Amino acid sequence: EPSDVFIGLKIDQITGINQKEENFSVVGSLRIDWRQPLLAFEHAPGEPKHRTYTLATFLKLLEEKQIRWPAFTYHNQQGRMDFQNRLISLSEDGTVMYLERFTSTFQAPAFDFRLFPFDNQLFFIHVDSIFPQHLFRFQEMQGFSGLGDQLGEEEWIVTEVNTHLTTHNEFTKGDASRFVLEFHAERHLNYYLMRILIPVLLIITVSWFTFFLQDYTKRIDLAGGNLLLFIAFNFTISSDLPRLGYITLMDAFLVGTFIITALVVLGNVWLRRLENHGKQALARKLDIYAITSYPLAYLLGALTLWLLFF
Amino acid sequence: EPSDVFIGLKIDQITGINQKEENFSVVGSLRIDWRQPLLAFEHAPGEPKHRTYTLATFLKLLEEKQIRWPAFTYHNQQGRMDFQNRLISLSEDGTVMYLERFTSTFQAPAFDFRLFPFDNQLFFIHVDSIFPQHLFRFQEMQGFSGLGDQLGEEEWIVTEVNTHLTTHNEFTKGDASRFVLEFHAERHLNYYLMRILIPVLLIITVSWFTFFLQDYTKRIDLAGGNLLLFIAFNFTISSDLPRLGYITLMDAFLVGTFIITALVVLGNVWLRRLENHGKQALARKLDIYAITSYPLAYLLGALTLWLLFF
Amino acid sequence: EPSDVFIGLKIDQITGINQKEENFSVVGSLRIDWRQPLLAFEHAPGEPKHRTYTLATFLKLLEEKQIRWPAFTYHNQQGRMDFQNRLISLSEDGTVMYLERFTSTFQAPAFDFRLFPFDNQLFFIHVDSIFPQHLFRFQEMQGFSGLGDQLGEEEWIVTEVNTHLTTHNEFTKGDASRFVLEFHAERHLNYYLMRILIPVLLIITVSWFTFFLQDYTKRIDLAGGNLLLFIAFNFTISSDLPRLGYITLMDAFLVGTFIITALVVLGNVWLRRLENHGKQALARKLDIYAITSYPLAYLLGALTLWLLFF
Amino acid sequence: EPSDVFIGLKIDQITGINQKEENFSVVGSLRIDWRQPLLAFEHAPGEPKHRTYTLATFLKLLEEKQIRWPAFTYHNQQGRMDFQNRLISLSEDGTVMYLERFTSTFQAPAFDFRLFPFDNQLFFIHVDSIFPQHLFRFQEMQGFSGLGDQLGEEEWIVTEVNTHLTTHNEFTKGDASRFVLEFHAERHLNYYLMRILIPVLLIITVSWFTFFLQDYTKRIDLAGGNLLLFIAFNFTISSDLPRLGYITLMDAFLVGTFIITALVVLGNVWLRRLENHGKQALARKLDIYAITSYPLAYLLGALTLWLLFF
Amino acid sequence: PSDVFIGLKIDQITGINQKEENFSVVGSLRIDWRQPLLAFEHAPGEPKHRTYTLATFLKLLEEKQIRWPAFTYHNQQGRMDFQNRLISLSEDGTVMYLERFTSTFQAPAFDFRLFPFDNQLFFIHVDSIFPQHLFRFQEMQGFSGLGDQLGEEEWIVTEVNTHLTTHNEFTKGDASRFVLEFHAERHLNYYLMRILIPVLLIITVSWFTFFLQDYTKRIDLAGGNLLLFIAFNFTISSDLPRLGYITLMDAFLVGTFIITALVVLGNVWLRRLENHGKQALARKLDIYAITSYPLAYLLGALTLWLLFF
Ligand SMILES: CCCCCCCCCO[C@@H]1O[C@H](CO)[C@@H](O)[C@H](O)[C@H]1O
Ligand SMILES: CCCCCCCCCO[C@@H]1O[C@H](CO)[C@@H](O)[C@H](O)[C@H]1O
Ligand SMILES: CCCCCCCCCO[C@@H]1O[C@H](CO)[C@@H](O)[C@H](O)[C@H]1O
Ligand SMILES: CCCCCCCCCO[C@@H]1O[C@H](CO)[C@@H](O)[C@H](O)[C@H]1O
Ligand SMILES: CCCCCCCCCO[C@@H]1O[C@H](CO)[C@@H](O)[C@H](O)[C@H]1O
Ligand SMILES: [Ba+2]
Ligand SMILES: [Zn+2]
Questions:
Q1: Chain centre distance of CA C111
Q2: What own/partner pairs with CB < 8 Å and gap ≥ 24 does B283-291 have?
Q3: Which chains are adjacent to chain B, needing at least 3 Cβ pairs under 8 Å?
Q4: Distance CA C303, CA E65 (A)
Q5: Binding site per annotation, positions of C for Zn(2+)
Q6: Contact of C157 with C191, CB cutoff 8 Å
């Protein structure tokens, strides 16, 4: 028969979410409760009912007693797992109580940037049993798992936390236990608002003010430089994300500003071409269309993305 | 009955405060005094009264003697704790004297940037007992804890240091001991003064000098470029802080310079529109308002933030 | 006679491909099946048929029993290999079942950037036996090796995976076993399209629009600044790659835009020289060649690279 | 009575001096000579007179023999100390000869940037005895300590090296031994000359050449842009240093160039105001003061800092 | 003294960091050392070669009261990440040791005076802690050198050498030192494509505009060119340490500053002539201004080439 292994995982801290590398880093406590009757002991009156062991004088004790421990792996772990505590408390009964306090980076392969910066992402930790379900079965330790109240994350906001059990077939033919701690998080848009939206809108709005000067060459010079600024913002955005094979909402927004700016250059080239061919009165009458085209083009673009993405 | 565990923590160095990641790094010495009568030993005349042990031939000795040690965790620790010394001195009495010399990063979740750069922050180290208060009780080792006199921090300045004891319920149902070393620090404004305030004020002041040239087009070109400079300073500031979900005093200050610059472009567009419509004498008379508006707008903005934040 | 050592390697994650350092990083599981009759054991009825050991109480057991283990090296490994699990399961038969779960960077010396960004690269992991083929022979463990289905890589896309066995002569005179896990990957061009192709083409296209203004000095100023922008893009590209001794397709493309821009400056200098020497009507008639030269030069350049590289 | 512990420290390499973090990194060899009569041994003819031990089979031997070793700490150490060698040679007499070869970062709290880049700094390594002077007394091992002849540092130049012994009271009530290896280093100014002084002087000198063009508007545009360049150099300098609470010689120099540039804008605004009010002949006569003011202002500024700092 | 056979092979050059003057390699260290005291008797059927993990082998040496040839990688920096540390002990007492590692090593031989046309010396120093009366290092033949898949793209190894010398680090008397040395030169393609071609383009296309005959436009052009060169000056400085000496590249950039400064100065003079009603004079002299520019840069190029070669 298989022995129940009680898994508990609690994330105390979110040391950071690195979206360029699609991983996240946490400070967490792993807790296991496992009754092995073979590990039970007799104690004399006055002698302790609970034996405290350092993993691995405990592992050395299991090898001596020829006992198999529920060897597990953090399936989505990355790099070094820095440990704080690896402590065992063994009761008279044979109940092993294990605590693993660590700092570690975990793969975040659920990353979908299609609606960035208005995106919601799934983050998880996979705890897998190396041995199959006929030997060990993972159970949910109640009263433990979840996320703490001082995570330290400022950009992200955790919407919900879940825990569940599933099978995996990594090293075995037969099903093996897998404990899952999942959490969903959405973004605080303040950074994007203050650094990208407000500046891009300002550049567009104050550039439109200069249309009231009625100098077509000055408009052309202005839209030309604006195009370079947007190319620069394009690089600012691209630095936050991986080199994706798909278009983001932000990417569409920037390509949109390129297209409109390109057309602003094209249109004011036409009006100045009229002035150059002795048709200044015509260009001055059409100028109302040039002045009102600019806000309509950006308002048409904004409605196009909002439709294409929502 | 529970055994008193005497906790002492001393920060020798502040290797740095990383406000983007909301953590801090220290070189510290942890000192513990714990009397365990079971660890007492008899010595022969001439033989040593104090046994010196490396943790973990000492831990190996505790496991042998079936003794439980006051297992603790640095609750707000992050990543690897690099140790320099982990030494035990055991007296005939059974008094364990432990010294833990380490370098470590700790979570700084008390970070409030709302008044940045005029902010004061709380930094702490949490030392928690894994075992509850019925087994072990943390006591304040007197004559030890605090901060050193060569911390090596140049930007921050420590205003006060405190030590206190409280309960926690991390791994247990019942209350467990927690030692706290807390310190408050404020910022040296010289960097912000020299690199952000003086340059932003200079750009504004020398830009106003050119109003005395009486060229409205030149003013428009100047305010336009100034707006781009402020957008660049906006990115310079944002690089120092996390991607916060809230507005800082600095953020308000930069948004303020955007608004005024936007209006300077708008106003000088109007004056130049008057000149273009054969009303140069009118624009020249109103020019006194345009020239005196600029300093009043920035002085009105400065009083608005100072009221909105103080 | 030689003993068959069954090698299995599975890449769970591609933590990243760093093309500037020509290496890649993976999370992988190494699996070995090796029957050593000398390690066989007798067990009593009811006692376990499978002994579970931590490498290296298992290594300590081999040294005791004076047995030589199939010592191996990851030949193309770089830096620290962070281990998650190093576990042995020893059957009554003497069948050692070893699992090595690790995170590691590996040298990528197969990097050929000549057709970048339209390049396809070879990535491999070399597992070598330290002892020669007369002692140990590597065999392909079936049902294991390959790449997982949640690699987490966004820019690269794996085209095919292969496993094979070959000889090496690293530390021995005679041939020694080598297990090879190879994979080919091509690039998602979306990043290059959105950040380099679209911006470079936009700068060129909107710059051509201004030719319709018929101001030769303005064209010269525009081409001059465009040349500086391309020099800046040249640095943006160079930051992605190592300091190669050869020319890439991208390098040819940028040098191409330099040459054409240099000639645009040269040509419009000539047309403006005609206007300056009272030959404005001649320069205006030739202007059709100057306006249609620009698109033909870039279209001629594009066909030259496409021929020179394909 | 107390036992003499002979301390020797030799820095082989300066892997770098990081002035932003106020620390330095070295590759060093620590050498200790300590006679413990209790460790003396009898050897049979033919058997070795010197026993070679790995620290810590040697430490395991001390714990067995119930002997206390002169436990020490590198007081100003930071982070991980990567060890190369930790070897003991024990003579028949009981003379322990210890060698500790390591790479480590050390706190540099003596950093005074007030005269940067013409500054001279103190760098030290503190080796402290954990046990007081009644048990162990540190002595200077002669013929060892100092700095090597291939340190590998290119910017800094070591002026002098010193070694001395003092007391500390870190973990004890009574005085405890402290070994000090101190060195003074000054900076090679070539980087600052080539990248900051020559460029800033060039910008100022070639900008003055254009005064001979007699275009006041062109001067205003030039001084305005020069001010932006100095603001950029201001950021270039600030990146090298910590966010100090005090003004450096460099900071004064940059603030100086801001003030003069601000005044150049102010003065040429006045001359152009004269020209605009039909007083061109007056502005042309005064122009000699404007042309000779510029070099006098920068020469007056240079004498002010040189007095204020020397 | 007992002969200790040292062999060192660099499999990979993980990188050369010229700003920190160090280099990083993946290497295999191989030692052959006969200690008769370690010899063993084996029964028929029992193994003739005992395989040990360093340090059950070191634990065996301490037991047998034997001194091992303790060594240090003298020019090593930071952590040496090990892959393999394996011993094979023959019946004879021949210890066969293999040390597979990744490590950074100090490169103190760095001479940037002719950068980017420089050739540098890189080495690894393996020192015996014990003197030559106890242990003597010998060259293990058939092993040492550099591999054929080093993975370095900018540098090209010109030659590899191995030799033995003495050191006096921890002892009064001479102690053995094994040296693996290699010389490497640079692939100039990066400098050509990113620094030479752009700087020459800026200079050449800027000269084209002289044919416009607008002295103010030339002044504005040379002024901005000076700022571009100041920016390239920072681009170059980022690759190297904060040296106390001038490089060929530094001289080249200072050269472009001087010529650009003079271009501003000269066209200020020509425009001063035009402003003082002497346009026909400035137009005749303009041939000297137009032909001065290429001569100044060609004179500068010959000055550096002489001063450095
Ligand atoms: C740029 C946003 C602010 C617009 C307000 C109008 C005043 C002019 C601001 O300077 C402009 O900056 C562009 C970007 O570099 C240049 O291309 C352009 O020639 C220049 O006139
Ligand atoms: C900019 C602060 C200094 C102001 C002093 C007046 C002289 C002109 C300085 O150059 C100006 O720089 C702006 C920013 O890029 C450009 O938009 C603008 O067109 C340009 O004239
Ligand atoms: C630059 C791509 C957009 C071209 C559209 C035409 C309008 C002008 C845009 O500003 C231009 O930017 C160049 C780059 O800095 C300068 O050299 C040039 O003098 C300036 O006029
Ligand atoms: C700038 C140092 C070189 C001065 C030599 C005179 C020629 C003009 C160089 O270009 C100038 O660059 C400034 C900085 O951006 C701009 O503000 C200014 O309007 C522009 O004319
Ligand atoms: C700059 C190399 C290309 C030269 C070709 C001539 C066309 C003009 C290119 O723009 C120029 O860029 C300089 C650098 O910022 C400015 O100083 C200058 O005023 C501006 O006109
Ligand atoms: Ba401009
Ligand atoms: Zn006593």
A1: 6
A2: B283/B216, B284/B214, B287/B214, B290/B211, B291/B211, B291/B212
A3: A, D
A4: 77
A5: 43, 92
A6: no
Give C181's strand partners.
Answer: C125, C163
The residue written with tokens 């931590």 in the block is C54
Out of A130, A269, A276, the one facing C87 most closely (by C-beta) is A130
Amino acid in the structure at residue D174: G
Q: What residues contact residue C155 under an 8 Å CB cut-off, 6+ apart? A: A242, A243, A244, A245, C17, C187, C188, C191
Task: Report which of A28, A211, B58, E79 is spatially closest to residue D79, judged by C-alpha positions.
Answer: E79
Amino acid type, A280? Q
In sign, the C-alpha dihedral spanning B176, B181, B186, B191 is: negative
Q: What are the beta bridge partners of residue A34?
A: A5, A96
Question: Phi, psi (5° rounding) for residue B93?
Answer: -60, -35
Method used to obtain the model: X-ray
Between the two ends of chain D, the Cα-to-Cα distance in Å is 53
Q: Helix H segments across chain B? A: 57-64, 190-192, 198-209, 216-238, 249-276, 280-309
Q: Which residue type occupies E17?
A: N
Residue tagged 């107390």 (tokens)? D2
Q: Which of D158, D210, D240, D287 is most worth mutating to test chain E (most E CB atoms within 10 A of its CB)?
A: D210
Nearest CA to ligand 1 atom 8: B221
Q: Is the peptide bond before A117 cis (omega within 30 degrees of 0)?
A: yes
User: What distance in Å separates the CA atoms of residue A195 and residue A190, rounded to the nearest whole number?
Assistant: 8
- What residues of A are in contact with residue C85 (Cβ under 8 Å)? 71, 73, 130
What is the Cα–Cα distance from C190 to B19, expressed in whole angstroms?
34
- Yes or no: say if C223 and C264 are a contact pair by the CB < 8 Å rule: yes
**Side chain identity at D138, as an amino acid letter?**
F
Segment D60-65 long-range contacts (CB within 8 Å, at least 24 positions apart): D60/B57, D62/B52, D63/B51, D63/B52, D63/B53, D63/B54, D63/B57, D65/D38, D65/D39
Report phi then psi at C296, rounded to 5. -70, -40
Cα dihedral E73→E74→E75→E78 (10° resolution): 60
The phi, psi pair for B154, rounded to 5°, reads -100, -30
Of E152, E159, E120, residue with least CA distance to E11: E152
Q: How far is CA E230 from the centre of its chain?
A: 26
**Which DSSP category does A193 fall into?**
I
Residue pointed to by tokens 């960097």:
B191
End-to-end CA distance of chain A: 53
C69 secondary structure, DSSP code: P
The Cα–Cα gap between E302 and E290 comes to 20
Is residue C111 within 8 Å of residue C95, measured between CB atoms?
no
Task: With residue E51 as reference, give the H or E element that holds it.
Answer: strand E49-53
Which residues, including other chains, have CB under 8 Å from residue A243's CB and lie 6 or more apart? C154, C155, C188, C190, C191
Distance CA D97, CA D35 (A): 9
Q: How far is the CA of B100 from the centre of ligand 7 (A)?
A: 27
For E179-206, give the secondary structure using H, E and C: EEEEEEEECCHHHHHHHHHHHHHHHHHH
The encoded tokens of residue D17 equal 């001096």
Which amino acids bring their CB within 6 angstroms of ligand 3? A 220-221, 224-225, 227-228, 265; C 203, 206-207, 210, 221-222, 224-226, 229
Q: How far is E68 from E103, CA to CA, in rounded Å?
A: 23
**CA-based nearest residue in chain B for residue A205:** B262
